[PDB]
Amino acid sequence: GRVIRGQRKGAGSVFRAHVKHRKGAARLRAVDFAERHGYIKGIVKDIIHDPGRGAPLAKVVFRDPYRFKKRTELFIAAEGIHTGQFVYCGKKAQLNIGNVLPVGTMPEGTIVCCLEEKPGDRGKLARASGNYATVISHNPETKKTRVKLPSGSKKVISSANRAVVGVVAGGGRIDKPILKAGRAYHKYKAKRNCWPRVRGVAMNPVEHPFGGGNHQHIGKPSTIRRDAPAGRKVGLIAARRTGRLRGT
RNA sequence: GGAGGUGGAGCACGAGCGCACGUGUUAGGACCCGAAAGAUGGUGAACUAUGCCUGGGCAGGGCGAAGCCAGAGGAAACUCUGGUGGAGGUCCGUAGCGGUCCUGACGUGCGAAUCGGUCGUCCGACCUGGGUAUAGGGGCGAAAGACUAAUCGAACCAUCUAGUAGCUGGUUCCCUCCAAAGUUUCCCUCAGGAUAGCUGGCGCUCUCCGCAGUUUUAUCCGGUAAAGCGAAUGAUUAGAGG
RNA sequence: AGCCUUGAAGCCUAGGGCGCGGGCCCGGGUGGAGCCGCCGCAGGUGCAGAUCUUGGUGGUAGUAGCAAAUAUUCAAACGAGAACUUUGAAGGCCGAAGUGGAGAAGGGUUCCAUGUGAACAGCAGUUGAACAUGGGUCAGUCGGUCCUGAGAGAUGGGCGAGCGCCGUUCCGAAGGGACGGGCGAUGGCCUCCGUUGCCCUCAGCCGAUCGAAAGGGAGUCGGGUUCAGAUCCCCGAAUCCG
RNA sequence: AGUUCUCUUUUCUUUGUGAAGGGCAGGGCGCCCUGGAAUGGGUUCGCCCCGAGAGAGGGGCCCGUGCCUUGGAAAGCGUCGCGGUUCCGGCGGCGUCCGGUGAGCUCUCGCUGGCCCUUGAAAAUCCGGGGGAGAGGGUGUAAAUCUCGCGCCGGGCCGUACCCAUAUCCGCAGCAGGUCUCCAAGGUGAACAGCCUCUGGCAUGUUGGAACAAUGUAGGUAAGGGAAGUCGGCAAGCCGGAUCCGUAACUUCGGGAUAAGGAUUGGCUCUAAGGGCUGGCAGCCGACUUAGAACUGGUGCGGACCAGGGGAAUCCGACUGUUUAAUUAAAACAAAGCAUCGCGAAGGCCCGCGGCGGGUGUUGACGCGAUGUGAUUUCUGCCCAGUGCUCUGAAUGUCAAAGUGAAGAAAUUCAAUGAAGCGCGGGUAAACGGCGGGAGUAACUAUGACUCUCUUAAGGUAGCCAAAUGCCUCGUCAUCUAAUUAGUGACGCGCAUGAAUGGAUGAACGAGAUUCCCACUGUCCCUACCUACUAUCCAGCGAAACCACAGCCAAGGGAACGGGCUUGGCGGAAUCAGCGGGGAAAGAAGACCCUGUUGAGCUUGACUCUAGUCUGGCACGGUGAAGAGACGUUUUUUCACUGACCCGGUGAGGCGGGGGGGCGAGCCGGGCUCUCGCUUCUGGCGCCAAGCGCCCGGCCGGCCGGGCGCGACCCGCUCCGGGGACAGUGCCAGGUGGGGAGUUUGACUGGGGCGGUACACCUGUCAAACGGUAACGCAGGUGUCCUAAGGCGAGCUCAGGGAGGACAGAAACCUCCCGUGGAGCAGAAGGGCAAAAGCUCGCUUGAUCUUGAUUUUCAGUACGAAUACAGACCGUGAAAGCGGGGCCUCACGAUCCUUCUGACCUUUUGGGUUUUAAGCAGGAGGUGUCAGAAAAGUUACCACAGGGAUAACUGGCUUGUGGCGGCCAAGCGUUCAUAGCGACGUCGCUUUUUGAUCCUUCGAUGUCGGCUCUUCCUAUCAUUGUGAAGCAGAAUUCACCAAGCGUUGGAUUGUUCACCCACUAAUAGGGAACGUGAGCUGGGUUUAGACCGUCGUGAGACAGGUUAGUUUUACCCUACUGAUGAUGUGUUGUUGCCAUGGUAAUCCUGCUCAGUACGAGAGGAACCGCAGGUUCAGACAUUUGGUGUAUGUGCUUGGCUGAGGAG
Ligand SMILES: [Mg+2]
Ligand SMILES: [Mg+2]
Ligand SMILES: [Mg+2]
Ligand SMILES: [Mg+2]
Ligand SMILES: [Mg+2]
Ligand SMILES: [Mg+2]
Ligand SMILES: [Mg+2]
Ligand SMILES: [Mg+2]
Ligand SMILES: [Mg+2]
Ligand SMILES: [Mg+2]
Ligand SMILES: [Mg+2]
Ligand SMILES: [Mg+2]
Ligand SMILES: [Mg+2]
Ligand SMILES: [Mg+2]
Ligand SMILES: [Mg+2]
Ligand SMILES: [Mg+2]
Ligand SMILES: [Mg+2]
Ligand SMILES: [Mg+2]
Ligand SMILES: [Mg+2]
Ligand SMILES: [Mg+2]
Ligand SMILES: [Mg+2]
Ligand SMILES: [Mg+2]
Ligand SMILES: [Mg+2]
Ligand SMILES: [Mg+2]
Ligand SMILES: [Mg+2]
Ligand SMILES: [Mg+2]
Ligand SMILES: [Mg+2]
Ligand SMILES: [Mg+2]
Ligand SMILES: [Mg+2]
Ligand SMILES: [Mg+2]
Ligand SMILES: [Mg+2]
Ligand SMILES: [Mg+2]
Ligand SMILES: [Mg+2]
Ligand SMILES: [Mg+2]
Ligand SMILES: [Mg+2]
Ligand SMILES: [Mg+2]
Ligand SMILES: [Mg+2]
Ligand SMILES: [Mg+2]
Ligand SMILES: [Mg+2]
Ligand SMILES: [Mg+2]
Ligand SMILES: [Mg+2]
Ligand SMILES: [Mg+2]
Ligand SMILES: [Mg+2]
Ligand SMILES: [Mg+2]
Ligand SMILES: [Mg+2]
Ligand SMILES: [Mg+2]
Ligand SMILES: [Mg+2]
Ligand SMILES: [Mg+2]
Ligand SMILES: [Mg+2]
Ligand SMILES: [Mg+2]
Ligand SMILES: [Mg+2]
Ligand SMILES: [Mg+2]
Ligand SMILES: [Mg+2]
Ligand SMILES: [Mg+2]
Ligand SMILES: [Mg+2]
Ligand SMILES: [Mg+2]
Ligand SMILES: [Mg+2]
Ligand SMILES: [Mg+2]
Ligand SMILES: [Mg+2]
Ligand SMILES: [Mg+2]
Ligand SMILES: [Mg+2]
Ligand SMILES: [Mg+2]
Ligand SMILES: [Mg+2]
Ligand SMILES: [Mg+2]
Ligand SMILES: [Mg+2]
Ligand SMILES: [Mg+2]
Ligand SMILES: [Mg+2]
Ligand SMILES: [Mg+2]
Ligand SMILES: [Mg+2]
Ligand SMILES: [Mg+2]
Ligand SMILES: [Mg+2]
Ligand SMILES: [Mg+2]
Ligand SMILES: [Mg+2]
Ligand SMILES: [Mg+2]
Ligand SMILES: [Mg+2]
Ligand SMILES: [Mg+2]
Ligand SMILES: [Mg+2]
Ligand SMILES: [Mg+2]
Ligand SMILES: [Mg+2]
Ligand SMILES: [Mg+2]
Ligand SMILES: [Mg+2]
Ligand SMILES: [Mg+2]
Ligand SMILES: [Mg+2]
Ligand SMILES: [Mg+2]
Ligand SMILES: [Mg+2]
Ligand SMILES: [Mg+2]
Ligand SMILES: [Mg+2]
Ligand SMILES: [Mg+2]
Ligand SMILES: [Mg+2]
Ligand SMILES: [Mg+2]
Ligand SMILES: [Mg+2]
Ligand SMILES: [Mg+2]
Ligand SMILES: [Mg+2]
Ligand SMILES: [Mg+2]
Ligand SMILES: [Mg+2]
What we know:
By secondary structure, the chain is mainly beta. Helices cover 7% and strands 24% of the residues. It contains 3 helices and 12 strands; from the N terminus they run ααββββββββββαββ.
């Protein structure tokens, strides 16, 4: 057989991300003395559409505490922030939508977005439009916090991780039917070469495990073990169950 | 050390070595020509496939979404009527792009895919130039095993390589003499080999008793043809007397 | 002590013969320089075939054919020669999505003048994009040149038997610059200023480089002019940059 | 300048001003000031705007490509007129003028809106602003400075022609192909449509002349009919623009929709309405439109061009979109929607030989990655047994290396321990998939709600169906027709329907499949005519395919279909136009089929591996506390540490500790518990130090200028965080591993496959009286069994029968008699056997050890089996003897390797001892394909070498079967065998059935059916002439001579076949390579795409359905059709003969005979005559019809010649 499409996606080539018109990587501020010990002020200059991303991005301007300069940051825009608003980042910022605070200082039940996976990484969790994490509890002895992620998993993270108060803007996006293949053509023309998707059973056995046959059938179970070699790991990968999810 | 059996490619008064010529068998390109393949290293995205960058392009009509204006009705909710408006992977249809049927033309063509009428679509998942990216068990594929320079169910180039072929084709002067086999056994043996038989050549040991695809005379051997079933085995018809 | 310019090989021949045959001898002609008998040696040594190789030639056969896109005619000229060339006049066609006028890619002299009519232009030609002999492309302002794009690609580093490969800010002492100030040295319109060396002071760019004759990118227009060049030459009037 | 016969103050051409600067229109402003607005107002085609300031006034700015002006009239152009060397930017006159209009077209500038789960580059480069470090002069000879106006100098290098495409480029070429752009006139018209014209261009596309035959290619037209044609309406035809009217089912309310169906349309002359400017009015200007009316023509008018046929349904797919470049455009693919699955980053998925490598990722679960289904609507049932996937694990079977323990001289052996994985247990079907059988039963019959029973993991639920899925099958009923293998609607024990392997539906849509209806027609009945280009003939020019030699037939035989050969018929130069019978014509070493110890693509439960991946050990690999062990050391568990190692951030910018200061608490002002480090209202600003303290320099306490410190705490060893002795990496070991690699996937065989085993053996037969002897010949057996069923000895005698004896009988046991084996001897059969070879006892291990010879198969090899001996040991018997397996004929296995037994055995390499190892001899472990490879599929995506050794056509032999025909005569026929039939039997013929066979063809003979066309057979349906009937007539039946002439139109089906409708004299049957594809067609079959069912894990398969799928060449020879001609008659002509060859007419209706013969009646003929018709043939055009480019004559659309007229 030949190399299957899933195998070919890894080599880059025609499967690389379309990043020509993107505005930059969205991140928090790099952690420095002001955020470690106090707060720093910023002003929301603009809120912009980012090609390929559902959530809007906010362009925030800070003062440089060591040089006569203005620093432009590119944040995930929490819902409800507006241009000309002041946002504040640091240990002693106040609990307001759009401010950046360590999760250790936030009371239980706070709703946050663009949360750091590790202290200082500048925001990695709950960045998709409409999403957010929640604060469950703190352990000041171990200096750690328990948060609930948009997938529903609960994670233990360092209390020093920063986050933005509120939920990401642009929520409810998936509630609209696309209605058109052409509208899905445009959705992914901004993202990457992944659309449309041809089915495994619709190919020949040379390019897919499910291909071939005088009937379009899988022929073999579609739940494939976790350790199957690349080019065989297709279908339901390491599925714990299958069928209709009935119940809780 | 003896006697008596038995295994040896031995001894029993050498015959070898060297050189040359022929014939045969074989290892080598191996009598000559012939695969589908496999391997190594390289050249191609000027066609085409797909992503990206930067440019160009797409008459005239039909239908008439939301929004809005006015008049009418109504207790309210709101309803009705006439206009305005100009949406759409919307419709007819040009350029363009494509290529349904005639199973039309042509079929040593104009053409290694073209031509005519008729047809699909024609603001979009649209058409297109150049730039750039992906290279051969690799790419790329809205998926036909499609496309990847007239090459694709694995490109092209050189080499390995005069690849192997129990298989097809061919195999070049004269006269003279002799002259077959298609059968036995073994073989992943059944289009092939080895093996015995059948042939030829070289002789040599004798001769001018031996032998014989023959009969004769003796002497054995045999269970077929025929015959038999009022003889065994098997099969089978009719009466008769007890 | 072979043959041969008093004629070798080769070739041709309704000439005379020999041999069962393979073949050979002699005669005549052409030819123009070498060749053969016998004893031995050696072999890339004998063709009718292989859809054999290469070259040549037939019949087919003066045959298929020279039928896509409406169309030609009259007179004159040159000339050996005219259905096809030139001029004039008619009749037609393309019918501004052109059979018009200009470019890009590609070609590379095909462009222009004169000459030829051998070959080629599937009839002909007095004609041609053929052949021959000579010419023709002029820029601060139109492009390239510069920028970066998708991307490509060195160094540091890493990997690698190795040619090398990965990688493009990532494991890097990555600045050879500057207003100014202070110490000197040299010169000149020697008055005092330049230049120049060192020290002090100041200093993010953070990625060499390549990448578009359609993207970004200052500034040229009118008239005339040649066989062929012109927003380039000449005339006139301007303008950007330094 | 054109026209002017007539008219036309006419028609045509032409009638400029660059850049840059200045000015002014015009356009735009989300710009300013006054002011304060509801009775809200302003305002656009739409919008939209306002107390966050509308209207109204007055300003400002930006673009001004428009106009004026300098440029600049000097130039250019038009026209007229003069000169020259006359190849002069030659010189002169005049002119280059005044207005209108527009949803017009093209370009551009601007305003305003809509669309996006799409938001639509970067950089070089240039500019403005904020700040104020600095500099400049001291009132002048002014300075620093100036983005102002002039002036001065320079701008190097490379490209530049021309073509730019029915002849400059790529397709071998001047190739009907391909190849990116810019400008873009008048008329008609909605129009960049088509048609005509101007500017510009061209010469008909690599030649001309003359004809006007066939057959073509491309256009047309056809009376009457109207799909009867054909697989199928293929093709053509109909409709078509616009206005006015009108418009159904169904529907997702958007559509359907140009539904369907009507009417109108020309020309001319008018009427009305629809506006602008200046000053309810007046005047002056204007742009095309709409509506209405009269008149008018031979009812013609969207007059050319342009330009939808329609309706009722069924299947499939929602749609738009895409696709096999070059045979498949589709129902296939995609799609939105739906549902699953993995993953929280040291991660999921993937790349990569390699790493601190790479893609997703400029990403973060509303995400990325992997699958299935396929819009909406409605629903999606049961099954976790199987196969997968997944989850739990010291509780725990197996389990590698390493490590631990014991034995030993050690090698080594043994033991304990026990990672993953497997086993074990849960979950899971929108994972792959799956979802029964029998019997009885309701008061007629039928069904059978109901019951019993076997049964699996469920036993097919809702639905749906002869569906693209049902074999039987052309299912049954109904509808559609005259007639229907078609369609539709129902039915449903459904070979083999069914629920995201999605079931059912349903609007809109479709170059998708199918049926019917209206309309239309040359598809047809049934063909004809016309036009153009060919073909044709000529001048010029000029190939190629192909070719053993060739080219007339019948039969024969022959490699079974001859051009050649045999026997006959016969044969006459050279040619032209056609033609498609033959040359089993050409084209390509057959793709089908088989064989090959030839492949390749693909699959998997094949064999052997392998990347990756999971898992354990060793190393890098450290520090310290505890817990549990073992004897101060050492193993292990937990908890920590950091310094290796890893990760993240940053321009490595304030880290740890202490000091200093502020608010609180609290003990008797001080000490501490302990916390804090100066920014949160506003879409400002924020650096390059102020201040203070202390030193220093230069000049005259005063000026000028420097340095340090505090401001800005001190000390520190990793920049700051996060991990961390683990990730990870290196090397080993176990598991997984069609993701990938290589390879295999027997043979025989009346083709192969399936089936068998005739593959190694044995008995009887074949087998033809020695032996041998074949077939997928016939009847059978074999892979064992036996401590005795081996060996010896003795003693007995068996099967069966007769007759007797308590229970006792057909059969128990006892007795006598007969008994040649009719029993038994393990088994298949054949042979053999009676004081034995059988049965029963006693004793035994000759079934032991050993060398040779021989026999059988045979090559005179091996094995196996067997035969005589010889040497030992033995058994048995009194002994002779007999016995080294079974009474005989079968019962079995090389080399290499392993294992055992044997010797005071040999070797173990410099010697010696000892373990080990190797030798030598004999057994065993096994190859059954049995003289002995280690081995699964599929290919319709397929390949090569061959094969007529071998299948799929024809032909050939045969003729079982099929068909047809006799003979006998029991019967039938009321009677009566034979008018007509005919059993039980039996003899033939035929090659239009199917077989059987494999002779020809696999370097190819085109595979069904139809169409068309000719010919032949007779086994006769009709017709002519006849014979016989159970022949009264009529009708019918049987038979004879007999193939002259006929044997038809249709519905369903691809059909051959079949069936039905209808007409008819009749509706006979057949051959010609199952006649006929260089004759067609291509419906079926039979490539590649795709769907369904059944089957398969799968790739894939299916004499099962379904849909779409390239049909090549003639100019050669012959034959045939026509056309010139040839011989020789001296030449030449006219008129003739006819040898030979062809050959043709056919059948039916009416009237009359005649309501007659005949007959009870009912019914009901015939000959002769008369009048017509059918089929066929040969002509013909007076008539009717068709054609019509006489391009004949009217009419007419658009354009063109100024108009008329003529065109
Ligand atoms: Mg595979
Ligand atoms: Mg496919
Ligand atoms: Mg020999
Ligand atoms: Mg060779
Ligand atoms: Mg040899
Ligand atoms: Mg190989
Ligand atoms: Mg390209
Ligand atoms: Mg459309
Ligand atoms: Mg359309
Ligand atoms: Mg065709
Ligand atoms: Mg042709
Ligand atoms: Mg690759
Ligand atoms: Mg396929
Ligand atoms: Mg070769
Ligand atoms: Mg062979
Ligand atoms: Mg063998
Ligand atoms: Mg052979
Ligand atoms: Mg016998
Ligand atoms: Mg006999
Ligand atoms: Mg001669
Ligand atoms: Mg010479
Ligand atoms: Mg030689
Ligand atoms: Mg030769
Ligand atoms: Mg030769
Ligand atoms: Mg000719
Ligand atoms: Mg042109
Ligand atoms: Mg030109
Ligand atoms: Mg010529
Ligand atoms: Mg020229
Ligand atoms: Mg590189
Ligand atoms: Mg550059
Ligand atoms: Mg450029
Ligand atoms: Mg106002
Ligand atoms: Mg003038
Ligand atoms: Mg300032
Ligand atoms: Mg030029
Ligand atoms: Mg012409
Ligand atoms: Mg011409
Ligand atoms: Mg041409
Ligand atoms: Mg031509
Ligand atoms: Mg007609
Ligand atoms: Mg008619
Ligand atoms: Mg019909
Ligand atoms: Mg018919
Ligand atoms: Mg049609
Ligand atoms: Mg309709
Ligand atoms: Mg579709
Ligand atoms: Mg595509
Ligand atoms: Mg195709
Ligand atoms: Mg097609
Ligand atoms: Mg699924
Ligand atoms: Mg299960
Ligand atoms: Mg059911
Ligand atoms: Mg029909
Ligand atoms: Mg039905
Ligand atoms: Mg289900
Ligand atoms: Mg199914
Ligand atoms: Mg000619
Ligand atoms: Mg022949
Ligand atoms: Mg002869
Ligand atoms: Mg023929
Ligand atoms: Mg042929
Ligand atoms: Mg062959
Ligand atoms: Mg072949
Ligand atoms: Mg073989
Ligand atoms: Mg293979
Ligand atoms: Mg291959
Ligand atoms: Mg296996
Ligand atoms: Mg595998
Ligand atoms: Mg494999
Ligand atoms: Mg075989
Ligand atoms: Mg005999
Ligand atoms: Mg005895
Ligand atoms: Mg003995
Ligand atoms: Mg015995
Ligand atoms: Mg061996
Ligand atoms: Mg297939
Ligand atoms: Mg098949
Ligand atoms: Mg046959
Ligand atoms: Mg018969
Ligand atoms: Mg009787
Ligand atoms: Mg044969
Ligand atoms: Mg035979
Ligand atoms: Mg042949
Ligand atoms: Mg033929
Ligand atoms: Mg007869
Ligand atoms: Mg036939
Ligand atoms: Mg034929
Ligand atoms: Mg054909
Ligand atoms: Mg077909
Ligand atoms: Mg097919
Ligand atoms: Mg299945
Ligand atoms: Mg007439
Ligand atoms: Mg007429
Ligand atoms: Mg007129």
